[PDB]
Structures are given as structure tokens and as C-alpha cells.
Amino acid sequence: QLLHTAHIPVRWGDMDSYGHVNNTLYFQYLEEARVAWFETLGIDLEGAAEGPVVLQSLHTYLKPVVHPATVVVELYAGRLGTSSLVLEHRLHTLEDPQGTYGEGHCKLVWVRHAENRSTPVPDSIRAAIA
Amino acid sequence: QLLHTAHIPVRWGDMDSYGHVNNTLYFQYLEEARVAWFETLGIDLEGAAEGPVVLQSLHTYLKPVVHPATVVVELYAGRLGTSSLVLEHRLHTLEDPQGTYGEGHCKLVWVRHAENRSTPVPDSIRAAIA
Amino acid sequence: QLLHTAHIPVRWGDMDSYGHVNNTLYFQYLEEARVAWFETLGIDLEGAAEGPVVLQSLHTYLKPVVHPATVVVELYAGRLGTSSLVLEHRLHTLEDPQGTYGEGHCKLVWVRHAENRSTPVPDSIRAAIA
Amino acid sequence: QLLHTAHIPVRWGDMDSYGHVNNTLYFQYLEEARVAWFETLGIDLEGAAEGPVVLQSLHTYLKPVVHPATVVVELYAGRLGTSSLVLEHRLHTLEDPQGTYGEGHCKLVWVRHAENRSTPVPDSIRAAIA
Ligand SMILES: [Cl-]
Numbered sequence: 001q002l003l004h005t006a007h008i009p010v011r012w013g014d015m016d017s018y019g020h021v022n023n024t025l026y027f028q029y030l031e032e033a034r035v036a037w038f039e040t041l042g043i044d045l046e047g048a049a050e051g052p053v054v055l056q057s058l059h060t061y062l063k064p065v066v067h068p069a070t071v072v073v074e075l076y077a078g079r080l081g082t083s084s085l086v087l088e089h090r091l092h093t094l095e096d097p098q099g100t101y102g103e104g105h106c107k108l109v110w111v112r113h114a115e116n117r118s119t120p121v122p123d124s125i126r127a128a129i130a
Numbered sequence: 131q132l133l134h135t136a137h138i139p140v141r142w143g144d145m146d147s148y149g150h151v152n153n154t155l156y157f158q159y160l161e162e163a164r165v166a167w168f169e170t171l172g173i174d175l176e177g178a179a180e181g182p183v184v185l186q187s188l189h190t191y192l193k194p195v196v197h198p199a200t201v202v203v204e205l206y207a208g209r210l211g212t213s214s215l216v217l218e219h220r221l222h223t224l225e226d227p228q229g230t231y232g233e234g235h236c237k238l239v240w241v242r243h244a245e246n247r248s249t250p251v252p253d254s255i256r257a258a259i260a
Numbered sequence: 261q262l263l264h265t266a267h268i269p270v271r272w273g274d275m276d277s278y279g280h281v282n283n284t285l286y287f288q289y290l291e292e293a294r295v296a297w298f299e300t301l302g303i304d305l306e307g308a309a310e311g312p313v314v315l316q317s318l319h320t321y322l323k324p325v326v327h328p329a330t331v332v333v334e335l336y337a338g339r340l341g342t343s344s345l346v347l348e349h350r351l352h353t354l355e356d357p358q359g360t361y362g363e364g365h366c367k368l369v370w371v372r373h374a375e376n377r378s379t380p381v382p383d384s385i386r387a388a389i390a
Numbered sequence: 391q392l393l394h395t396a397h398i399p400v401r402w403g404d405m406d407s408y409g410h411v412n413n414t415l416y417f418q419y420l421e422e423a424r425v426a427w428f429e430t431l432g433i434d435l436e437g438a439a440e441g442p443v444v445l446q447s448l449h450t451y452l453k454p455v456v457h458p459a460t461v462v463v464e465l466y467a468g469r470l471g472t473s474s475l476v477l478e479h480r481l482h483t484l485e486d487p488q489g490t491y492g493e494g495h496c497k498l499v500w501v502r503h504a505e506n507r508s509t510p511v512p513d514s515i516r517a518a519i520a
């Protein structure tokens with residue numbers, strides 16, 4: 001199930017000395033896409049007592065991106081636990097909407113932060129998925 | 131004279147622990163705007179033997195930007211020398227198009243890179259300004 | 261087998277609005293550690309016709325880092341193929357040398373870049389591992 | 391008067407497609423140096439009700455830095471007002487301690503943040519300077 005599609009313009013300063021987007025920056029793109037998805041659901045990250053924490057990131061690099069470009073990040077529902085969710089991702093560009101530039105996943109766990117303890121996934125996400 | 135207006139979306143990761151865009155990032159926004167202006171003029175930065183080099187950056191911070199936001203960078207023609215140009219800038223947001231969030235300038239000098247020597251400003255810029 | 265230990269100071273600007281190092285930045289730390297390992301082996305990344313390309317990154321986030329801190333990145337030899345190597349990593353801090361802050365791996369493939377084709381791993385790495 | 395000397399290792403990912411440190415990153419180096427100076431004075435930036443805010447940054451780029459390198463940031467006392475201080479800077483490298491790679495200043499104003507109003511510079515800084 002597709003949860004969210006984000007369009008993330010590439011900045012010239014995102015490139016490294018290889019002259020393509022630096023490999024680190026793809027994780028910022030993925031972060032931006034999740035933040036936008038969270039925003040659509042009123043999860044604002046703005047110092048809430050409970051919210052999603054990244055446990056694990058996996059990314060496979062398949063094709064480089066070169067400025068100027070707009071990266072398209074598709075987020076898909078992976079497995080939902082009581083307090084965790086796997087968000088699967090695929091990355092394309094606007095000019096190359098069917099090329100897969102990279103893919104992977106982000107495992108999120110919902111935690112009450114001041115307490116360091118897992119808490120249930122919000123109703124909105126259960127509703128979206130389930 | 132207004133040379134270029136760029137729209138630069140703010141990324142959540144652009145913020146620092148103060149919860150506003152980190153002061154360093156405004157220079158990336160200014161860089162992106164100049165790169166876009168250069169692109170409109172076919173100055174591609176893509177390893178040309180000659181091109182613009184930043185000599186000096188000045189920026190005055192007036193109002194913070196908080197995600198989500200789109201920064202609007204206006205570039206104005208400052209003083210043009212035989213091989214240098216002052217690009218004056220003003221920064222607003224899309225939601226606050228008349229608030230000045232920051233302002234300053236970037237002095238550019240055209241140089242042949244392998245030689246470290248100043249060269250004339252391209253005709254396109256002289257034409258645009260003059 | 262431990263291949264390399266890098267010490268990577270944390271910069272204040274590495275933190276995000278959560279007030280810990282931004283999750284993206286751990287990949288820069290891992291990149292810096294690999295670049296330093298490569299440097300010890302005279303793999304300079306400086307535009308060589310052949311060299312290592314990141315195929316995949318996996319990282320598990322276990323404990324946050326807060327500025328000021330020095331991240332310690334340990335790189336271990338994972339599985340070696342004819343033209344690929346898995347570099348396994350563990351992350352600690354100088355003050356907490358036995359806490360595991362994160363762990364994962366980076367799969368590298370050696371490729372001739374202008375040709376997009378896999379090439380053998382350098383003798384130095386085979387020698388180090390084997 | 392020299393207030394502080396910081397040593398800031400350059401990271402490979404600090405470089406852009408020109409193959410030198412990206413011009414934006416010098417401002418991060420300057421930020422790191424000020425944060426370290428502030429730390430020596432027990433100004434911790436960690437959510438204090440009052441503290442220094444950057445009003446203006448000026449930097450002149452004189453020589454590029456190429457990885458690997460350690461940037462040396464020297465901070466000097468410029469003019470002290472009742473609630474502002476100009477911190478003048480000069481940038482060198484460890485290998486080139488007398489080459490000036492860049493120079494400029496950062497104007498800081500002390501402000502109570504929740505109120506947006508200038509407040510006196512801390513005794514420690516007046517003592518250091520005066
Ligand atoms: Cl595109």
C-alpha cells in the first residue's frame with residue numbers, strides 16, 4: 001500500500017566531489033518524506049511526549065542522482081506491530097519516474113521519550129494501514 | 131535590478147537544536163539561488179575552465195525560519211566590475227513574502243581555475259545588467 | 261577482524277531539533293571512517309578510474325549521541341567476494357567506549373566507473389583480510 | 391586579543407563537486423569554534439533563557455581547503471557593546487598555520503529569547519575582553 005509520495009528537490013550542495021548526490025543525503029530525502037507523511041497525519045515532531053523513533057535504516061543504492069533533479073520518494077506500508085512500523089521506500093526522479101534509483105526501508109518504533117518505553121502506534125496509522 | 135527569484139523548500143534536517151533553520155543553511159539557500167540563476171544563463175559549473183568564484187559572503191540574520199517553509203531568495207545586481215559582480219540578496223518566505231528574514235551580498239569574481247587569474251564577466255551577465 | 265578505528269568529533273550543527281545528532285549524520289561518520297581506512301591503503305577516491313562504490317547501507321540506531329562528543333567508528337571485515345566486501349561497523353563514543361550506539365554494515369563493490377562494471381578488490385584489502 | 395583557537399577536522403563529505411570544501415561549510419567551522427569558546431565559558435546553548443544570537447556573518451574566501459585537512463579557527467575580540475560583540479576570525483590549516491584561508495567576523499547580540507530583547511553580555515566575556 002502506498003502511504004505517501006514526496007517530491008524533494010536536489011540542491012547543488014547535496015553533491016560531493018564525485019559530482020553526484022552524496023550517499024548520506026538520500027537519508028535526508030527519506031527523512032523529509034517521512035516528516036511530510038507524519039505532517040499529513042498531524043504527527044508534528046515538535047516536542048511531543050510520544051512519537052516515532054527510527055530504529056533501523058536500510059538503503060540500496062542503484063543509480064546516482066545528478067543536480068538539477070527532483071527526487072521522488074514513495075513510502076509504502078510494511079509490517080505493522082503494536083508499536084512499530086516498517087516503512088518501505090522506493091526512490092525515483094521526476095524525469096525518470098520508473099527508474100529505481102534506490103530502495104530500502106525504515107523501521108520506526110513509537111516511544112514515550114522522557115521514559116524510553118514503547119507505546120502504541122497512533123490510530124491514524126493503524127486506520128491508514130488497517 | 132532583480133536578476134533572479136528562487137524558491138527553496140526548507141528541509142526538516144536543516145534545523146538545529148534551537149528548532150529553527152541552522153544559520154549555516156542560509157548560505158546553502160543563497161548558493162542554490164545563484165546556481166539556478168547561473169543555470170538560466172548556461173553557466174553550468176560542471177567543470178568549466180572559467181567561471182564564478184565566491185570571494186566574499188555577507189549575511190544579516192533578521193528573522194528565523196521554521197519548518198515547514200519555502201524560502202524565497204531574491205538576487206539583485208550590485209556593482210559590476212570587469213571580472214567581478216556583487217550579487218545583493220534578500221530572503222523572505224512564501225507565506226511572508228514581504229518580511230525580510232535576512233539580507234546581504236555575495237561578491238563573485240570570474241577566474242580561469244587552472245591558472246588562478248581573473249577573466250572577464252560573461253556577455254550574458256553584462257547584457258542582463260548593462 | 262578489526263580493519264580500522266576512526267575517531268570522528270561531533271559538531272554542534274550535526275544535531276537536529278531533537279537535540280541529539282541527526283540520524284542522517286551517522287552515515288557521514290561511517291563515510292569518514294571508510295575514507296580514512298581507504299586512505300591508509302592508498303585508495304584516495306581522488307578520481308581514480310576504478311574504486312569502491314557503496315551498494316547498500318544498513319544501520320541500527322541504539323543510543324543517541326549528544327554534543328560535545330567524539331564518535332568512535334570500528335570497521336570490521338565482513339564477507340569478501342571477488343569484487344565486493346561487506347564492511348561491518350560498530351559505533352561507540354570516546355567517553356563510552358563499550359556502549360554500542362549503533363551498528364550495521366556497508367556493502368561495497370569495486371567498479372570501473374566510466375564503464376559501470378565490477379572489477380577485482382585491490383590486493384591490499386585481500387591481503388588485509390586474507 | 392586572541393580569545394580562542396579551535397581545531398576542526400575536515401570531513402570528506404564537506405567537499406562539493408569542485409573537490410574542495412563547500413563554501414557553506416566554513417560557516418559550520420566558525421560555528422563550531424564559537425560553540426567551543428562558549429563552552430569554555432559555561433555558555434552551553436542548551437536551552438538557556440538568554441544567550442548569544444548571530445546578527446551578521448561576513449567571510450572572505452582566500453584559499454580553498456582540500457580533504458584531508460584540519461582547519462584552525464582563531465577567534466579575536468572585536469568591538470564590545472553593552473549587549474553585542476564582534477568576534478573577528480581568521481582561518482588557517484594545521485599544515486599551513488600561517489596561510490590565511492579565510493577571514494571575517496560574526497556579530498553577536500545577547501538576547502532573552504522568549505522576549506526578543508537585548509540583554510547584557512555575560513561577565514565572563516566582559517572580563518575576558520575587559
Ligand atoms: Cl528530475
Ligand SMILES: [Cl-]
Pocket residue numbers: 198199200201223224225226
Ligand atoms: Cl513558507
Ligand SMILES: [Cl-]
Pocket residue numbers: 328329330331353354355356
Ligand atoms: Cl565522547
Ligand SMILES: [Cl-]
Pocket residue numbers: 458459460461483484485486
Ligand atoms: Cl591540515
